[PDB]
Amino acid sequence: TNSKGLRRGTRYMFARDFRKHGVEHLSTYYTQYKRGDLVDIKTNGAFQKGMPFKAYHGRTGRIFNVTRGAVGIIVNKRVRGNILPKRINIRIEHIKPSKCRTDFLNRVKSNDEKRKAAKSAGQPVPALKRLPVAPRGAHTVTTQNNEPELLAPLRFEIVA
């Protein structure tokens, strides 16, 4: 059986990227984190304090606490037939804002703005629903300067 140390099998997971070692740039510390925000977890090997467990690497969580240089995150973890919302205290260096929620918030803003504009201007309420890409419509293709090229299977050649 395997040993059960904290950093077993993280040889590449906790390593830095090629030609990306050294001093950690400061935007990491300038980023703003508020409780209720969604963050991706990606361990930074250069910082050994407040490191997330390997199980949480690459997962997204919701912030529930904001301390001086760390955040508490609620991350879903599957244990047998239940998903547990584990709470973990991770430092800022291992955290990154999640764009999935921000995209949705932008879409909500656009929807509200479009609805307000249409109602104010008396236009009919617009369609504010994402729809799956439908099958292509009917069209005409012209062969002018694009004559069809007759293709045939090629014979076998002995490429030594």
């Binding site: 694009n146 069809p148 007759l150 293709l151 045939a152 299977p153 014979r155 076998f156």
Partner: protein
């Protein structure tokens, strides 16, 4: 695997093209002559060959047209030459074969049956590179050439006739020679 199912394979002309993108607002149009049982198989085989030849697959491409081709004059006999490439249990080979038929589709069907008979090769291992009508003087296979004679004649030597809708037993004498 693809099979040459069906008596007398059909012939289709399939025209397709890669779906235009921003970097390529106009794309070349490709055309192929396919021999298949029906048009669904024709389209699938067209995409097979076009993806082999050009960097395009069914996902990024579209079919502009697919039309069945019928023999112009099925009342005349022609010699057909077939250039094909096929896979044996050991290696890859090119073959040239000849048939006599009233339809090019019939000739290609004959080719598939003959390849199965003489080389145990299935349709999934055969590529029909080319099919054409060859002149009588341009044929190069003895079996075909032996019928390019205006005075051809031969009997039917040993004719075994099967009784169709009558009892198994008879007192009649069976004759295999008919002069």
């Amino acid at each position: 695997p693809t099979k040459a199912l069906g008596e007398t394979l059909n012939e289709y002309v399939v025209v397709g093209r890669k779906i235009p993108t921003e970097k390529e607002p106009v794309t070349p149009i490709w055309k192929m002559q396919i021999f298949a049982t029906n048009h669904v198989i024709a389209k699938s085989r067209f995409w097979y060959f076009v993806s082999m030849l050009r960097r395009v697959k069914k996902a990024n491409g579209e079919i502009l047209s697919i039309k069945q081709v019928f023999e112009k004059n099925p009342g005349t006999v022609k010699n057909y030459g077939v250039w094909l490439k096929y896979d044996s249990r050991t290696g890859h080979h090119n073959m040239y074969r000849e048939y006599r038929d009233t339809t090019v589709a019939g000739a290609v069907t004959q080719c598939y049956r003959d390849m199965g008979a003489r080389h145990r090769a299935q349709a999934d291992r055969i590529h029909i590179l080319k099919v054409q009508t060859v002149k009588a003087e341009d044929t190069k296979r003895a079996g075909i050439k032996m019928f390019h004679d205006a005075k051809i004649r031969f009997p039917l030597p040993h004719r075994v006739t099967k009784r169709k809708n009558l009892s198994v037993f008879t007192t009649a004498r069976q004759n295999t020679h008919f002069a």
